[PDB]
RNA sequence: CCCUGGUGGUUAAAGAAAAGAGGAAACACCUGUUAUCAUUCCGAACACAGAAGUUAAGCUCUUAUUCGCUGAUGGUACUGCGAGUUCGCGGGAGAGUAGGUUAUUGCCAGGG
RNA sequence: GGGUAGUUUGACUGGGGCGGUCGCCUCCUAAAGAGUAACGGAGGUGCGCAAAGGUUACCUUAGAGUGGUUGGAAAUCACUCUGUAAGUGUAAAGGCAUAAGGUAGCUUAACUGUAAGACUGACAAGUCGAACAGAUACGAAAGUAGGUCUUAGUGAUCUGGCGGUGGCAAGUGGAAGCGCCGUCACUUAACGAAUAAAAGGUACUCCGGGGAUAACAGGCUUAUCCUUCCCAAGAGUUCACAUC
RNA sequence: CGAAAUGGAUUUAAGUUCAGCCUUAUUUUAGUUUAAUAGAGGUAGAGCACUAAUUGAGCUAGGGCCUGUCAAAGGGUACCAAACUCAGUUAAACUCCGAAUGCUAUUAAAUGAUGAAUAGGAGUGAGACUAUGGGCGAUAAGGUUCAUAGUCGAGAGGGAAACAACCCAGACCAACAGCUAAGGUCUCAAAAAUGUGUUAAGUGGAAAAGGAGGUUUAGGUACGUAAACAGCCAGGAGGUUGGCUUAGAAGCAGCCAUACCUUUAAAGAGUGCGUAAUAGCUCACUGGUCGAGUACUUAAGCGCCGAUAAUGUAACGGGGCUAAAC
């Protein structure tokens, strides 16, 4: 009850502070946010001048058939990079979205980095 | 038995310097205050002493959200 | 006496008191009330003089409620001084009353005896008064 | 007269165009003139121009 | 499209409490601490590795509005001005009363 | 070394003296922009911190109730309700849940040259500031940092000391010295600071003026004073009003 | 054409200087008041949601009192009373709320040089009262200190009998012309008559707490042609010295109620007078003679008393006025 509620509350507070520390995204340099469920892994690129998701990816996508490991998110970030290049976006701001930059997120981010995306 | 007190500081001239709807250019001071009596919205910045100033030319506007006042340049 | 037992500040500025009463203007705890017809200050000590009068007139018949409490210092400079130093010192306590304040309330006794007792009280206050029955019960 | 009246009202009357007693001015009633006339109603006499 | 999840926009609480309903997918609970990682002790949280089990809680929806929040119309206080004087013109609360309220919506992903 | 000489010995002030006060900061007075006086009402201050500064990341008090070795009203531990009432070096106010509060890691931006545009303002001054070049700290990055949550902890000019630079160098070349940059020494507190250097008496007094200002009278006021009057608990053998 | 007596600083407070206000010259054109739209307050007011003060009940920790008491665990709680609940108040340094005016921006009209910049020359830096909001004082001062506006200052004329600051109104000069503002229209003294009421105090032509069968109008509660009230004629009692305290208290020192009954027409544990104590005289109470409003109150319009100093009527300017007052 109260313990789960306060865990949620802490997550929200962290999320909000992160958001206004990094600022909003613009069509030139939109914002990349992630979400880490118990099963999957989601990423969205958002332009807040419109509230529009320019691109997105997740491990639910059957064709990718990745898992939920460091290796899998490496490949997933590769796919995201190749999907964004054809929509000619190279600058992104990395909203860690209430998580700690470590492990899976670290591998995701570095994978977007080796392939010419400025985060 | 004289007066034990009688001591006052110099008035600091706080308050809103540009009224909502006025046209300002970059760098104008909008509010002088102690503390965020008014908070910062789009296109404004907060000085080290909570002064509100305009980052770009535009028109001042005040909004209210959950009872807090926000200053913006639109 | 009647007086507050602790104050934030010992001395306060004499305002201008005006207008009728918009609150504390209805009979609440009793049967008969002693409304005022003026706006003025009632000292604590006149308050207790009126209270003695009412209570003594009432041979245990009922209860008396006092609807005002002074809580306002009244300062007075020493006897022989000039206009120099400032805000001399508290002397006695005043309560504020406006036209329509109930000011006193009584319970238990027959209406005639209450009216007599409460004229006996009004004889010692500095304001015109009026004795009111509930005017919506009997 | 304008002597002794409030400063704001003297300004309103000079904005209407009246400086002396016996001053004659024709004006077209819109909201502005209506507001000025309401401000200074006690010092004017209004007749209508058929 | 609808459901679910994520992420915004518009501010009136979009607030908590109790009762009931579900859970395909999705979300969450949940399982182990062994690898990198974390706590001024604790794998609780954070972090990594996963699919044995469940709506119990979180979550969504439905309830008497139970608490809160919001709240008219009139009247009063107050008030600008006035050769009408407790009067003439204009503005008009707070409290209370009748009520109301358990949000709405943009585009991304999954499958209906 | 008052034997002698030249002088100083503040102002505000419900007359002057005595007393108190003099700069700066917070609130009220202040009449809902700013400003606004009194010997009006309450306080603080002439600092502290090598972190109590910078940044990254993570956490949330106090109170009430409840179960507990000493342990008691109250120490530490756990839960429920309450939801900032706690806590922010230091007064008060304005702020502070994204916390500006608490903890830990690293660290020195407690930087050089600048600065569009402003606020406040007699002047002198004071205050905010995006952004740019150099070079760092933290961070994966975006970005933040030109001391401290904000507003008090301060002192002009002249004179002199210290370090740097190498501009001026009285015929020339040096040098003394000066200028420039960095910086130190003033309860100059009477705090916009008359001097580097300053107390009293005059009824022996003198001069220039003032009813701008006191003592005697007139005037305004009536606290105080005096004269009444309203209420009548009572005293008076009973009987408030013969009387008090 | 036309100020200022303010702000800042000062070995300054009766001085001086800068700003503010004035004038001349040139340039510039955009003050000022509305209306509409849109903004930030925290004042008046209000409120108890915060910080404090505070009223009466309800509840109840804790503290003592008492009691099966040791000082074990206890119980009766008049109380001393935290917290909490309901109802009701106070605040410049309280605010969950919150105006009106005022302030700022834009636009459109309206007013016509009232704005601003540069330069030459200043003066002023002692203010006063009146209408509001305040602080100090004693909600005293023609007091002192601030804010807004006005007047005087620097303003003549008319009115308030006289009376710089109040009311009306801004004097270029002349006229033996008219209409009006304030204020007036019996007379001094230029100007009024009519309509409906009120006032008996010359109120008008000073004032309080309080007293008050003054009167006009309006409205309640008692009470009444089935007899009210005042008077007049009767009863106004029996039980019962109500039990008593006391010495007595017989209705009338004093305690208690008089849920004390009967004959009841009506008679009270008596209204007053007065007796040591009664005794005694009266009243409420009720009956007959009479014959309609009466008895207590409420709101207004005028009045009454309270009313009260010293050269001389002297608180209408005078004469006077019953309107020539309201």
Whether B52 and B43 have beta carbons less than 8 Å apart is answered as no
C-alpha B71/C-alpha C135 separation (Å) is 56
Numbers of helices and strands, H then E, in chain B: 0, 8
Residues with their C more than 2.5 Å from the N of the next written residue in chain C, i.e. before a break, are: none
Give residue C111's region: left, alpha or beta (phi > 0; psi -120 to 50). Answer: alpha
Between the alpha carbon of residue B68 and those of residues A30, B36, B41, B71, C34, the distances in Å are: 29, 10, 11, 10, 48
Looking at beta carbons, which residues of chain C come within 8 Å of B4?
Answer: none
Helix, strand, coil percentages (3-state) for chain A, rounded to 5, are 40, 20, 40
User: And the tokens for B50?
Assistant: 């909570």
Closest-CA residue of chain B to C78: B1
Task: Quote the Cα angle for C89-C92-C96, to 5°.
Answer: 115
Using CB atoms, which chains have 3+ pairs under 8 A with C? B
Q: Does C82 touch chain B (CB under 8 A)?
A: no
C-alpha A23/C-alpha B42 separation (Å) is 11
The answer to whether the C-beta of D42 is closer than 7 A to strand E is: yes
Experimental method: cryo-EM
- C33 has which bridge partners? C105, C132
C-alpha C48/C-alpha A19 separation (Å) is 67
C-alpha B16/C-alpha A53 separation (Å) is 39
Size of interface B-C (CB pairs under 8 A): 6
C-alpha C128/C-alpha C28 separation (Å) is 21
Resolution in A: 2.9
Whether B71 and B41 have beta carbons less than 8 Å apart is answered as yes
C-alpha A31/C-alpha A24 separation (Å) is 7
The answer to whether the C-beta of A101 is closer than 7 A to strand F is: yes
- C106 has which bridge partners? C32, C64
Tokens 């007086």 belong to which residue?
Answer: C3
Q: How many angstroms away from the CA of C51 is the closest CA of chain B?
A: 39
User: And the tokens for B65?
Assistant: 């959200």
C-alpha A78/C-alpha B64 separation (Å) is 44
User: And the tokens for C61?
Assistant: 């018949």
Q: How many angstroms away from the CA of B1 is the closest CA of chain C?
A: 7
Our measurement of CA D33 to C1' G131, in angstroms, reads 29
How many CB atoms within 10 Å of residue A31? 21
Tokens 């000025």 belong to which residue?
Answer: D36
C-alpha dihedral sign at A66, A72, A77, A79: negative
Give residue C77's region: left, alpha or beta (phi > 0; psi -120 to 50). Answer: beta
User: And the tokens for A107?
Assistant: 């591998």
CA D50 to chain centre: 20
The answer to whether the C-beta of A96 is closer than 7 A to strand E is: no
Reduced to 3 states (helix: H, G, I; strand: E, B; else coil), residue D24 is: coil
Between the alpha carbon of residue B2 and those of residues A102, B54, C78, the distances in Å are: 70, 50, 13
């Amino acid at each position: 009850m109260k313990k789960i509620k306060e865990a949620e509350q802490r997550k929200l507070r962290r999320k909000k502070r992160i958001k206004d520390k990094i600022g909003r995204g613009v069509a030139s340099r939109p914002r990349i946010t992630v979400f880490k469920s118990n099963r999957y892994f989601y990423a969205q690129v958002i332009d807040d001048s419109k509230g529009h998701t320019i691109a997105s990816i997740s491990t639910i996508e059957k064709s990718l058939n990745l898992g939920k490991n460091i290796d899998d998110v490496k490949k997933l970030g590769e796919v995201l990079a190749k999907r964004l290049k054809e929509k000619n976006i190279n600058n992104l701001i990395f909203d860690r979205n209430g998580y700690k930059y470590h492990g899976l997120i670290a591998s995701f981010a570095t994978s977007l980095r080796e392939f010419g995306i400025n985060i | 038995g004289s007066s034990k007190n009688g001591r006052d500081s110099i008035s600091k001239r706080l308050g809103v310097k540009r009224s909502g709807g006025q046209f300002v250019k970059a760098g104008e001071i909008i509010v002088r205050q102690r503390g965020t009596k008014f908070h910062k919205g789009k296109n404004v910045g907060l000085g080290r002493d909570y002064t509100i100033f305009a980052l770009s030319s535009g028109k001042v506007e005040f909004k209210t959200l959950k009872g807090r006042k926000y200053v913006s340049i639109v | 006496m009647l007086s507050p037992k602790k104050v934030k500040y010992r001395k306060k500025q004499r305002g201008r008191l005006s207008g009728e009463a918009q609150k504390g203007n209805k009979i609440s705890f009793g049967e008969y009330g002693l409304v005022s017809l003026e706006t003025n200050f009632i000292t604590a000590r006149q308050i207790e003089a009126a209270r003695i009068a009412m209570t003594r007139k009432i041979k245990r018949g009922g209860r008396v409620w006092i609807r005002i409490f002074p809580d306002i210092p009244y300062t007075k400079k020493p006897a022989e001084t000039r206009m120099g130093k400032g805000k001399g010192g508290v002397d006695h306590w005043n309560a504020p009353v406006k036209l329509g304040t109930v000011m006193f309330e009584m319970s238990g006794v027959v209406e005639e005896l209450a009216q007599e007792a409460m004229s006996l009280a009004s004889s010692k206050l500095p304001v015109k008064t009026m004795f009111v029955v509930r005017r919506d019960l009997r | 007269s304008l002597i002794g009246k409030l400063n704001k009202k003297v300004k309103v009357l000079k904005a209407l165009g009246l400086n002396k007693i016996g001053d004659k001015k024709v004006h077209f009633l819109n909201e502005s003139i209506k507001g000025m006339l309401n401000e200074t109603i006690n010092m004017i006499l209004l007749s209508e121009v058929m």
